[PDB]
Amino acid sequence: VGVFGCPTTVANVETVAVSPTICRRGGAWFASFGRERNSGTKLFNISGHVNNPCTVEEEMSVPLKELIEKHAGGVTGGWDNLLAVIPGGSSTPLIPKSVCETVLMDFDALIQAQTGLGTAAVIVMDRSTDIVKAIARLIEFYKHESCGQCTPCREGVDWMNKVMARFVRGDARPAEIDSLWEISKQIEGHTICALGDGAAWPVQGLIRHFRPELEERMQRFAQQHQ
Amino acid sequence: ASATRLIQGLRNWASGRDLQAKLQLRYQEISKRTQPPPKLPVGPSHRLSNNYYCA
Ligand SMILES: Cc1cc2nc3c(=O)[nH]c(=O)nc-3n(C[C@H](O)[C@H](O)[C@H](O)COP(=O)(O)O)c2cc1C
Numbered sequence: 669v670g671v672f673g674c675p676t677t678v679a680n681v682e683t684v685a686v687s688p689t690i691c692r693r694g695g696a697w698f699a700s701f702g703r704e705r706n707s708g709t710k711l712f713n714i715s716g717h718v719n720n721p722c723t724v725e726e727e728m729s730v731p732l733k734e735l736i737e738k739h740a741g742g743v744t745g746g747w748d749n750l751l752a753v754i755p756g757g758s759s760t761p762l763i764p765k766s767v768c769e770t771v772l773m774d775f776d777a778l779i780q781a782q783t784g785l786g787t788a789a790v791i792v793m794d795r796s797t798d799i800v801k802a803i804a805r806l807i808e809f810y811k812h813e814s815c816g817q818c819t820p821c822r823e824g825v826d827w828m829n830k831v832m833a834r835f836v837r838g839d840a841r842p843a844e845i846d847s848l849w850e851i852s853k854q855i856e857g858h859t860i861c862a863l864g865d866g867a868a869w870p871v872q873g874l875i876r877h878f879r880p881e882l883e884e885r886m887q888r889f890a891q892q893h894q
Numbered sequence: 895a896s897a898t899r900l901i902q903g904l905r906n907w908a909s910g911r912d913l914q915a916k917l918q919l920r921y922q923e924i925s926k927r928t929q930p931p932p933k934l935p936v937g938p939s940h941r942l943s944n945n946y947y948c949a
């Protein structure tokens with residue numbers, strides 16, 4: 669039951685456009701690139717804090733450091749200036765600088781990094797970035813773009829945006845980090861589509877990789893306002 | 895407590911005990927009628943995490 673109640677396949681622009689190239693060039697040709705069950709080429713959108721933000725077609729299992737340093741010229745201030753990378757657009761959890769050294773930009777090697785590939789959209793965030801402001805703006809995106817149909821997204825994404833807007837200032841106590849984690853686990857997997865999942869995932873990534881930065885944010889708020 | 899020492903001594907002799915140490919009439923030593931405002935502590939389930947009701 670798809671469009672108008674007919675049989676329907678909804679498919680991406682990329683996975684539709686490459687299919688005559690697969691039929692002309694061959695199946696084994698498209699399967700030769702990348703790892704096994706990660707076959708082919710892929711469009712990568714390197715944006716954020718790089719020198720040359722650009723769209724580039726690249727082989728599937730390319731390293732992230734090689735991709736950013738070659739096609740984008742590296743992070744603004746060098747690779748040592750890297751702080752975090754959202755690997756595949758906003759739905760995927762971010763990975764810190766300690767993971768971006770050896771990670772591969774296909775599905776499975778990012779799933780091993782407890783994130784996802786997704787849309788293959790490399791958002792690069794250097795040391796000059798307030799990461800909490802960026803992730804709270806990302807949750808602001810997921811509450812301004814959410815259709816309000818079922819309960820956990822409609823309520824909890826606004827509630828995660830309120831808790832993240834307080835985490836930007838630090839107007840909380842650290843027991844509201846883990847609390848917020850539970851709120852993500854009360855959204856991830858209990859909604860209709862994966863925008864509840866795509867909004868629970870960045871909160872989980874931010875907590876899991878920069879819990880002490882949120883904690884020192886909140887403690888310096890608590891000392892400078894008391 | 896205002897019993898004079900002759901009546902106080904006669905009363906201690908008649909009872910046989912020391913009565914002024916243990917008076918059954920209350921005086922200034924009891925608590926104040928106006929108490930300061932308290933701060934009552936919260937229970938063990940007043941937590942924001944790991945606090946599911948099913949467990
Ligand atoms: C909230 C949400 C938004 C999505 N937006 C797009 C989109 O804009 N474009 C797209 O190709 N897939 C999008 N998807 C993924 C689709 O559900 C689906 O996987 C895809 O459109 C078709 O599958 P395919 O990968 O075989 O082409 C979105 C998924 C979710 C949960």
Ligand code: SF4
Binds near residue numbers: 818819859
């Ligand atoms: S959870 Fe999904 S179906 Fe529900 S309002 Fe959010 S995006 Fe819509």
